[PDB]
Every structure is written in structure tokens, then in C-alpha cells.
Amino acid sequence: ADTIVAVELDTYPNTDIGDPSYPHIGIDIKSVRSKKTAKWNMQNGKVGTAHIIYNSVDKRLSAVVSYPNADSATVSYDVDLDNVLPEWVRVGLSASTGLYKETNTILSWSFTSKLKSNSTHETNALHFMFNQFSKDQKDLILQGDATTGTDGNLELTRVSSNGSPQGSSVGRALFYAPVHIWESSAVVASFEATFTFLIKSPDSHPADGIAFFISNIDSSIPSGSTGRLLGLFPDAN
Amino acid sequence: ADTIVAVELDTYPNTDIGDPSYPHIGIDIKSVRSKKTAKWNMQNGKVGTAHIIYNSVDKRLSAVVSYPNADSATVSYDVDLDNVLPEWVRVGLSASTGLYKETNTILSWSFTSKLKSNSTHETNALHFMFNQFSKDQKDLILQGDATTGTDGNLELTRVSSNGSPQGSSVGRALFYAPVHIWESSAVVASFEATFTFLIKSPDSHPADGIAFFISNIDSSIPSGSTGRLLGLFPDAN
Amino acid sequence: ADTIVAVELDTYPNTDIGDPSYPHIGIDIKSVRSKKTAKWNMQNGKVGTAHIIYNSVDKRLSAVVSYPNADSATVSYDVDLDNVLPEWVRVGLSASTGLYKETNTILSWSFTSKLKSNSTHETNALHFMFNQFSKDQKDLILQGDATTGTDGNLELTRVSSNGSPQGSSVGRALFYAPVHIWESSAVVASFEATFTFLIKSPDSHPADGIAFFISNIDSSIPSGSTGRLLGLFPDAN
Amino acid sequence: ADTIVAVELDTYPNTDIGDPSYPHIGIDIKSVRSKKTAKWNMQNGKVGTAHIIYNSVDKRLSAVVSYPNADSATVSYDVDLDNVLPEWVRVGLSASTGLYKETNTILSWSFTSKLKSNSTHETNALHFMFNQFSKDQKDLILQGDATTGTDGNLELTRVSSNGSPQGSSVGRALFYAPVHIWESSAVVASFEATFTFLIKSPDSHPADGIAFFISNIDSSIPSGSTGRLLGLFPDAN
Numbered sequence: 001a002d003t004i005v006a007v008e009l010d011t012y013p014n015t016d017i018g019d020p021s022y023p024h025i026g027i028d029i030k031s032v033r034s035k036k037t038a039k040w041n042m043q044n045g046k047v048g049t050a051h052i053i054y055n056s057v058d059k060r061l062s063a064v065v066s067y068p069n070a071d072s073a074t075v076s077y078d079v080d081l082d083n084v085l086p087e088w089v090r091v092g093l094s095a096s097t098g099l100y101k102e103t104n105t106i107l108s109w110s111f112t113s114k115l116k117s118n119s120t121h122e123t124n125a126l127h128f129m130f131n132q133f134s135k136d137q138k139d140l141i142l143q144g145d146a147t148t149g150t151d152g153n154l155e156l157t158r159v160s161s162n163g164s165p166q167g168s169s170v171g172r173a174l175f176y177a178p179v180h181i182w183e184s185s186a187v188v189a190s191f192e193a194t195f196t197f198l199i200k201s202p203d204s205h206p207a208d209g210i211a212f213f214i215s216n217i218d219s220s221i222p223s224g225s226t227g228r229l230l231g232l233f234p235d236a237n
Numbered sequence: 238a239d240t241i242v243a244v245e246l247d248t249y250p251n252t253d254i255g256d257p258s259y260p261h262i263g264i265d266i267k268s269v270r271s272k273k274t275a276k277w278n279m280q281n282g283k284v285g286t287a288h289i290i291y292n293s294v295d296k297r298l299s300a301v302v303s304y305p306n307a308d309s310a311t312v313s314y315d316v317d318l319d320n321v322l323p324e325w326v327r328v329g330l331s332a333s334t335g336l337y338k339e340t341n342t343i344l345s346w347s348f349t350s351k352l353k354s355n356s357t358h359e360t361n362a363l364h365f366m367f368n369q370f371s372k373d374q375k376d377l378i379l380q381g382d383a384t385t386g387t388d389g390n391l392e393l394t395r396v397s398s399n400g401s402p403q404g405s406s407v408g409r410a411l412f413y414a415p416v417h418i419w420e421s422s423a424v425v426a427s428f429e430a431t432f433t434f435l436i437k438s439p440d441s442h443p444a445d446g447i448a449f450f451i452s453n454i455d456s457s458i459p460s461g462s463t464g465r466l467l468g469l470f471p472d473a474n
Numbered sequence: 475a476d477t478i479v480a481v482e483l484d485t486y487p488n489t490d491i492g493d494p495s496y497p498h499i500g501i502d503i504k505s506v507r508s509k510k511t512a513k514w515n516m517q518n519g520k521v522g523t524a525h526i527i528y529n530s531v532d533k534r535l536s537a538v539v540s541y542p543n544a545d546s547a548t549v550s551y552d553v554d555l556d557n558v559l560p561e562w563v564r565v566g567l568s569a570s571t572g573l574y575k576e577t578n579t580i581l582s583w584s585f586t587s588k589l590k591s592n593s594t595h596e597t598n599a600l601h602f603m604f605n606q607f608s609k610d611q612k613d614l615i616l617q618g619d620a621t622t623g624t625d626g627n628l629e630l631t632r633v634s635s636n637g638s639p640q641g642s643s644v645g646r647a648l649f650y651a652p653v654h655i656w657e658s659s660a661v662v663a664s665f666e667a668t669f670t671f672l673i674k675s676p677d678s679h680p681a682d683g684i685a686f687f688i689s690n691i692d693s694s695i696p697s698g699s700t701g702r703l704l705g706l707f708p709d710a711n
Numbered sequence: 712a713d714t715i716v717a718v719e720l721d722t723y724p725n726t727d728i729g730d731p732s733y734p735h736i737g738i739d740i741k742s743v744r745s746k747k748t749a750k751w752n753m754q755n756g757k758v759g760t761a762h763i764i765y766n767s768v769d770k771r772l773s774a775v776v777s778y779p780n781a782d783s784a785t786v787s788y789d790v791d792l793d794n795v796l797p798e799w800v801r802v803g804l805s806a807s808t809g810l811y812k813e814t815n816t817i818l819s820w821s822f823t824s825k826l827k828s829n830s831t832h833e834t835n836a837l838h839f840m841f842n843q844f845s846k847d848q849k850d851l852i853l854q855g856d857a858t859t860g861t862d863g864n865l866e867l868t869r870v871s872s873n874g875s876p877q878g879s880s881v882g883r884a885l886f887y888a889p890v891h892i893w894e895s896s897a898v899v900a901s902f903e904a905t906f907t908f909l910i911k912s913p914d915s916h917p918a919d920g921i922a923f924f925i926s927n928i929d930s931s932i933p934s935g936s937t938g939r940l941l942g943l944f945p946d947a948n
């Protein structure tokens with residue numbers, strides 16, 4: 001199977017697979033059953049911002065999700081990504097819907113990764129910033145139901161011609177270039193990601209969520225990973 | 238054939254195809270026969286720096302090449318890249334040797350491209366920076382004789398186990414992700430590239446040169462493009 | 475007197491001092507009487523974006539001003555800033571009102587300057603980005619009527635408690651640190667600035683405008699420079 | 712007195728004030744008696760690199776110091792800078808010598824700070840990068856014995872016309888613009904700094920060290936702070 005590290009923005013409480021009984025953010029290390037979660041007051045129809053950070057000095061993956069004028073939700077987990085991911089990865093966004101549904105609309109996405117050796121200063125970096133998505137956007141790999149360009153946004157899951165979100169949908173967008181996330185003899189490595197999103201739904205209990213993820217380069221949507229599996233995992237183990 | 242825009246650092250005067258009678262820098266728009274050149278005092282065995290810039294307001298492709306303590310060489314050409322390149326491209330470095338030879342060693346390479354629409358501020362960007370090259374560097378497409386990792390450098394053309402450069406060699410490195418270089422309704426677009434290089438040779442007249450280039454995404458080394466064709470063109474038309 | 479280079483967004487046609495008979499953008503080199511202008515269709519009450527660029531290879535100061543869905547206004551002028559400005563400068567925004575008036579509200583302001591020598595690669599840079607202004611924002615020098623913090627914006631000229639703009643107002647904001655804009659032996663130098671703005675007015679002919687400017691470090695608002703002088707010049711020479 | 716947070720690169724073991732018995736790196740929060748230290752194998756005459764990082768999610772100040780081909784030294788301390796520093800600060804480098812001495816030569820210094828509110832995305836940033844220092848470098852405040860420009864370097868402490876370091880010296884360089892390091896309602900704030908340095912000495916036990924520091928805006932060298940006090944503190948409390 002793929003190898004996945006992710007930050008989930010999980011809108012739907014699947015208590016039969018260990019979710020808490022409320023919408024939540026979580027750190028997922030090789031399982032949908034998050035290693036750490038925090039309560040998240042998702043605001044239906046408002047634009048939110050997610051920030052994700054990591055560095056190899058502290059070996060701590062952290063995320064903060066906010067809406068204007070409200071308390072943020074923050075979650076952190078101590079993990080050494082050298083012990084989890086391959087050296088080269090792709091980074092992406094994923095989302096899903098199930099019985100219940102929501103738009104999984106990405107309005108912007110930026111990412112930076114740095115890798116520094118002990119040679120003097122000698123540091124490599126990748127940075128991208130999408131504030132407008134186009135169709136046929138050749139620097140993204142779209143998987144499943146994801147589309148780009150409608151109103152300049154990335155729609156990870158299916159929406160009808162008028163903006164009604166559909167159930168049983170899954171889609172992802174991966175940046176085209178591989179990213180060098182760690183190296184045996186690097187002095188320091190770090191990354192950060194930010195995205196803004198609009199989750200809107202007619203349902204009183206929207207579903208299923210959005211995730212930022214890091215995977216093996218050749219990662220693909222696992223069969224059946226709509227709904228609670230967020231396009232990331234083949235099962236709930 | 239491919240579509241190529243390039244800045245050549247041309248070490249060898251091929252006067253039978255229109256080169257001036259001295260080493261030179263040049264702007265190449267769909268032909269090896271440069272649209273503009275400037276005299277270049279290449280310094281055998283020293284580390285040089287090349288800077289390339291362009292923006293869609295001025296529609297001027299410019300380059301400056303320097304060595305410490307010496308005068309720089311600068312060349313500029315008015316060209317609207319919308320009229321030459323496809324919207325999506327790859328960017329790369331190319332080099333060659335022929336009867337005469339030189340190392341075509343790249344010590345660093347950075348690139349930034351920005352594309353801004355009239356939506357408020359709404360600007361997309363790509364930036365990469367390689368100050369150390371690794372082997373099996375998955376964010377580069379290596380073509381021909383190019384290799385990475387030896388002493389942390391990118392060797393575009395063949396060098397023997399002790400650093401002796403070989404004749405009749407050609408090689409290129411392209412960044413893996415496509416780059417969005419223009420768009421129909423962009424307000425402004427720009428790019429810049431910088432690389433540092435070490436051209437060393439036992440020959441009194443080193444050959445053939447290094448180029449930074451922008452091409453169709455699927456560009457490959459044209460058959461026979463060693464020597465004076467710099468890995469870029471199939472012929473000298 | 476101060477030494478000023480500026481890009482003016484001039485909302486009011488002062489034909490008695492050489493303005494064209496329409497709102498316009500202009501390049502001002504040591505005089506309010508622009509060296510080059512272009513027609514500008516300012517949209518009362520809409521958010522606009524201004525981009526300004528310059529580099530020492532091309533020696534061309536260019537600006538583009540846009541509103542969503544409309545044609546942009548662009549102006550360019552060939553000038554070598556080594557011949558006009560001191561080596562060290564401050565950068566800022568200025569605005570004014572006169573008999574007629576408008577809000578001169580800055581929603582965001584970013585700036586980057588780079589200066590590279592021929593030492594290998596050896597390049598210095600300054601970048602700032604304000605997307606929210608606070609009061610008592612210690613990295614800005616506010617002059618005249620300019621205030622910060624109201625709704626997170628920079629109000630260059632006076633606005634009443636309800637947002638009504640006032641006449642006969644002038645104000646400026648300068649970044650606190652001096653900027654090294656050129657050097658005798660630099661290989662390349664460049665800068666860019668971007669700001670977003672909201673000019674709104676009850677008048678059918680709003681006045682007077684906004685400018686991005688570069689000045690001697692100790693620049694101050696010239697006496698009497700409300701109105702057509704944009705907070706920049708002591709007279710219309 | 713001033714308020715100081717610093718990362719010390721302490722070359723001389725002052726065991727009478729709590730230093731360990733070896734050269735060390737340390738995190739100093741309002742005292743020269745570090746809250747955390749790590750052993751540091753300083754290499755006389757070699758160029759080292761220091762990296763310092765902090766973010767408000769994790770509230771952890773960390774530093775890593777390296778020389779090519781050797782193990783790095785790393786130290787970290789959990790501290791919420793909101794509880795220690797004023798909202799607005801200056802950032803700087805400091806160094807000293809005493810009875811024993813060393814060059815405290817800075818070859819490069821970069822810094823980035825970001826402050827993001829919950830307004831959508833709305834983030835402010837400052838970045839500077841000095842790879843060459845000039846004299847009369849107007850974006851630095853030099854204090855004490857610090858000078859700039861000799862061979863393009865920043866010499867924090869006194870060196871004779873031939874490069875012999877002098878005892879009983881202290882000097883600092885602060886970036887001119889204040890930095891907004893925290894805010895009451897920010898969602899996330901972060902900073903990073905990197906510098907490269909050359910500490911060379913004729914002494915078998917070089918002294919006293921270099922520090923990166925963050926202080927009240929109006930900070931000045933405390934009287935008598937040569938030697939073990941690193942230009943930072945008035946006493947060893």
C-alpha cells in the first residue's frame with residue numbers, strides 16, 4: 001500500500017472507527033485512526049485557513065486551523081518523518097464525501113520545503129503558491145473527482161453545475177514535482193504548507209473532510225476510500 | 238521539432254554558423270544563430286555566475302554573466318514570449334562538447350516564475366533552489382550524459398573519474414514540474430534564473446558551452462546536437 | 475529639497491500643471507510633471523492593484539495598475555536610477571486630497587529589493603509584506619495625516635469616523651529601514667513593489683491620488699504639498 | 712535593563728558563572744546563565760553555520776550549529792516568547808573577547824519573521840539577507856567595536872590591520888527595522904535566523920563567543936559586558 005502522513009480536517013464523526021464525537025483535526029501517521037486529535041468548530045459556508053509545519057530539529061508535526069474571529073484548533077504530534085516516509089515524496093490535498101456531503105473547495109495552496117546540508121550554507125528549497133487554479137493545470141496531478149478552474153478554485157470533490165456538493169465522491173491534487181523531505185546527512189530539513197478552503201453543505205452534519213498529505217511519489221487513491229477514509233487509506237486499520 | 242528559447246554561454250566560435258570570432262553570450266529564439274550576442278571573456282577554471290530575467294510588462298529577455306573582479310557580459314533582446322513558447326513549459330540547463338571540450342559543471346541553480354491575474358492580487362509562483370545536487374535527484378529530469386551528485390555538483394557533460402572533460406558529449410537537466418510561463422489573461426508574468434558554473438579545460442579553445450533554456454514540456458536532446466548545437470537544436474538553421 | 479522618484483496614480487486632472495485631461499498613471503523623476511503617463515480608468519469604490527518593477531540591467535521603471543475584469547494601465551520610462559537617487563533610500567506610499575477628495579486606503583503593500591555583487595553569488599535582499607496594518611506599527615514611519623490600524627488598513631489621508639474622506643489632506647508611510655538601491659560595483663540590482671488600494675469618493679471627480687515613491691532617507695512631506703503635489707513635491711516645477 | 716533572548720555560541724568555559732567545562736551552545740532567557748546548553752566542538756579557523764528557529768504553535772526555541780563533515784550541536788528550550796519579550800523588538804548579532812580572544816567574523820546573516828492573523832490568510836512578513844556587508848551599511852545599527860565592509864564581512868569585535876583579534880572587545884549589529892515578534896490575536900507567528908561565521912584565534916582557549924539575540928528596540932551594549940557577558944547582559948545573574 002501507499003505510505004501516508006496527513007493532517008485531516010475531519011468534518012464527520014465516525015465513532016465506529018475511533019473518531020471523537022465531534023468534528024476534529026488530526027495527525028494521521030500511516031492510519032486514518034489519528035495519533036492525536038483536537039476539537040474543531042468547522043463553520044459551514046465560511047472560508048477557513050489551515051497551516052501545517054514541521055522541522056527535523058524538533059521532530060514535531062503541527063497544524064493550526066482558523067476562521068476569522070474565532071478560536072483556532074491546533075494539534076501536534078512528535079514524529080520523526082525519517083522513520084515514516086521515503087526520502088522523496090509527493091505532497092497533496094485530498095477530500096471525500098459519503099452518505100453526507102460538502103463542498104471541498106480549495107481557494108489557495110502554498111508549500112515550502114527546505115533541506116540543508118553541513119556544507120557551507122548549501123540549502124535547497126522548493127516553494128509553490130497557487131492562489132488561482134486553472135484548468136489543465138499541468139503542475140498538478142488530479143486524481144479521482146478533483147477538478148480545477150471553476151471560478152479559479154480547486155474542487156476536490158464533485159459539485160453540480162450550480163454548486164451543490166455530491167455524495168460518494170473522492171478526489172486529490174498532488175504537486176507534480178517530487179519533494180526531498182529528508183536526507184541521511186542533512187543538518188536541517190523543514191516544511192510548511194498553508195491552504196484556504198470553503199466547506200459548505202446542505203446537511204446538518206457535513207462530511208467527510210479535507211486532508212493535506214505526504215506520500216510515496218506514485219500514490220493513488222485507494223480503492224473504496226470515499227467517505228470516512230478521506231481518499232487516503234484502503235481501510236480503517 | 239521542439240520549441241526553444243535559450244541564453245547561451247558559448248565558449249567556442251563556430252564562425253561557419255554565424256558565431257562571432259570570440260566566446261560570447263547570446264539570446265537564442267528558435268535558432269542557434271543568436272538574435273543578439275555580446276562578447277564574453279570566459280575564465281578557464283574560475284566559477285562564474287549567470288543571471289537571466291524576463292517580465293511581460295517590458296517583454297525583454299536579458300542576461301548577465303560575471304566572474305569576480307571582472308567586467309560582466311550582458312545581452313538583451315526584445316521578445317514577447319507569448320509569441321514564441323507554449324503556455325506551459327519546462328526549464329532546464331544544457332551543455333555540450335565537440336572536438337574541443339570543457340567541464341560543464343553546475344554548482345547551483347535557482348529559478349522563480351510568477352503569474353498574476355487581475356483578480357485581487359491573486360498570484361501564483363514557483364521557486365526552486367539547488368545549491369547541492371544529489372544522485373537520484375527526483376525533481377530533475379537528466380538527459381544524455383548529465384549526472385548529479387559527484388561532489389554535490391551537476392555535471393552536464395561527461396567527465397572522467399579524475400575530472401578530465403570528454404569530447405563529443407551532450408547533456409541536460411530539466412526541472413520536473415511544468416512551469417506556467419504566460420496566460421491569455423494574466424496581468425503580469427515574470428521569471429528569473431541564476432546558476433553558477435565552472436568551465437575548465439585543457440584546451441586553449443574550450444568548447445562548446447552551457448545554456449539555460451525554456452522548452453515544450455516533452456523536449457528531448459535533438460539527435461546529433463553535440464558540439465556547436467549545445468544540446469538544443471537539430472541543425473544550425 | 476528631497477530627491478523623489480515615484481509612480482503616481484493620479485486621479486485628478488490638473489491641466490494647468492501638465493496633467494492630461496483624464497485620470498492617469500505616471501512616472502515622476504524629480505518633478506510632479508510626469509516623464510511618461512498612461513490613461514487610467516480608476517474605478518470608484520473598487521479594490522485596485524499596482525505593481526512596480528525595475529532592474530539595473532534594463533534600466534527601465536515600469537508600472538501596471540489593474541482592477542478585476544478590466545484592462546490594465548501600464549507605463550514605463552527608461553531611467554538609470556544611479557543617476558537620480560542616492561545609494562541608500564527609503565521607500566514609501568503617499569497620497570493627498572485637495573478641493574476634491576477620496577479615500578486613499580492601502581489594504582496591502584509588499585516590497586523586495588536585491589543587490590548582487592560579482593563575488594560568488596553574494597546577494598543581499600530585503601523583503602517585506604504588509605497584508606494587515608496595526609496601530610503603532612513600529613516598522614513604518616507615518617507622516618502627516620496617515621494612520622494605521624483602522625480595520626487593519628493604512629489610511630494615507632484623513633477619513634472621518636464613518637469613512638467619509640476629507641479634503642486638503644496629505645499623508646505618507648515609509649518603511650523604517652533604509653534600502654540599498656544601487657552600488658558602484660554591483661552586478662545587478664532590482665526591486666519590485668505591489669500594493670492594493672481602495673479609492674472611494676462622493677465626488678464625481680475624485681482627487682488627488684496615491685503614489686509609490688523612493689526618496690532620500692530623511693524625506694519629509696514638503697510644506698503645502700496637499701492636492702496636486704501628492705505629498706511629494708514642494709512645487710509643480 | 713534591556714530584555715534579552717539569545718542563542719549563545721560560547722567558546723570559553725566560565726565555570727565560575729555556571730558554564731559547563733567545554734565550549735557550548737546555549738539558550739539564554741533574560742540571563743547569561745543558559746536555560747539549556749549543549750556541547751559544541753568549535754573548530755578554530757573554519758567557517759561555521761548557525762540556524763535558529765521558533766514558532767508560536769510549538770513555543771520552542773531551537774538552534775543548530777554545524778561545520779562541514781562534523782556532527783552538529785543542537786539545543787532547544789520550551790519558552791513562550793509572549794511571556795518574555797515586548798511585542799516589537801530588534802534582532803541582532805553580538806560578540807565579545809576578554810583576556811582570551813578570537814575573530815568574531817560574520818560572513819552572512821539572514822532572518823525571516825512572519826505574523827499571521829485569522830483574517831483570511833492575511834500574513835505579514837519581514838525577510839533580510841546579507842551575504843556581503845558594506846561600510847556605512849545603513850540598514851544595520853553597529854554598536855561598540857563592530858565594523859562592516861572589511862573584505863565584505865561584519866567584524867563584531869576588534870581585529871588589527873592584519874587580522875589579529877584583540878582582547879577586551881565587544882560589538883553588536885542590529886537590523887534597523889523593528890520586528891513584530893508576537894501579537895495578542897495572531898494565529899501563528901514564527902521566525903528563523905541563519906548566520907555563517909569564522910572564529911579564529913592564536914589562543915589554545917579562544918574567547919568569548921557570538922550570539923544571535925532579540926531585544927527591546929532601544930537595546931544598547933551594557934556597561935562592562937566584554938568577556939563572558941557576550942555584549943548582552945550587565946551581570947551574570
Ligand SMILES: OC[C@H]1O[C@H](O[C@H]2[C@@H](O)[C@H](O)[C@@H](CO)O[C@@H]2O)[C@@H](O)[C@@H](O)[C@@H]1O
Nearest residue numbers: 012016097098099100207208226227228
Ligand atoms: O458521509 C458520512 C459517512 O457516510 C457513510 O456512513 C454512514 C452509514 O452509511 C454507515 O452505515 C454508518 C456506520 O458505519 O456510518 C454512517 O452513519 C459512509 O459513506 C462513511 O464512510 C461516511 O463517513
Ligand SMILES: OC[C@H]1O[C@H](O[C@H]2[C@@H](O)[C@H](O)[C@@H](CO)O[C@@H]2O)[C@@H](O)[C@@H](O)[C@@H]1O
Nearest residue numbers: 249253334335336337444445463464465
Ligand atoms: O568542439 C568544437 C567544435 O568541434 C567540431 O568542429 C570543428 C571541426 O570538427 C569542424 O570540421 C569545423 C568546421 O565546421 O569546425 C571545427 O573546427 C564540432 O564538434 C563542432 O560542433 C564543435 O563546435
Ligand SMILES: OC[C@H]1O[C@H](O[C@H]2[C@@H](O)[C@H](O)[C@@H](CO)O[C@@H]2O)[C@@H](O)[C@@H](O)[C@@H]1O
Nearest residue numbers: 486490571572573574681682700701702
Ligand atoms: O483636489 C483637486 C484640486 O483642488 C484644488 O484645485 C482646484 C482649484 O482650487 C484651483 O483654483 C484650480 C486651478 O489651479 O484647480 C482646481 O480646480 C487644489 O487643492 C489642487 O491642488 C487639487 O489638485
Ligand SMILES: OC[C@H]1O[C@H](O[C@H]2[C@@H](O)[C@H](O)[C@@H](CO)O[C@@H]2O)[C@@H](O)[C@@H](O)[C@@H]1O
Nearest residue numbers: 723727808809810811918919937938939
Ligand atoms: O576571555 C576569557 C575570560 O577572560 C577574563 O576572565 C579570566 C580571568 O581574568 C578571571 O579572573 C577568571 C575568573 O573569573 O576567569 C578567567 O580566567 C574575563 O575577561 C572574562 O570575562 C572572559 O570570559
Ligand SMILES: [Ca+2]
Nearest residue numbers: 010012013014
Ligand atoms: Ca471522520
Ligand SMILES: [Ca+2]
Nearest residue numbers: 247249250251
Ligand atoms: Ca559556438
Ligand SMILES: [Ca+2]
Nearest residue numbers: 484486487488
Ligand atoms: Ca493631478
Ligand SMILES: [Ca+2]
Nearest residue numbers: 721723724725
Ligand atoms: Ca563563557
Ligand SMILES: [Mn+2]
Nearest residue numbers: 010019026034
Ligand atoms: Mn478523524
Ligand SMILES: [Mn+2]
Nearest residue numbers: 247256263271
Ligand atoms: Mn553562439
Ligand SMILES: [Mn+2]
Nearest residue numbers: 484493500508
Ligand atoms: Mn499627474
Ligand SMILES: [Mn+2]
Nearest residue numbers: 721730737745
Ligand atoms: Mn555559556
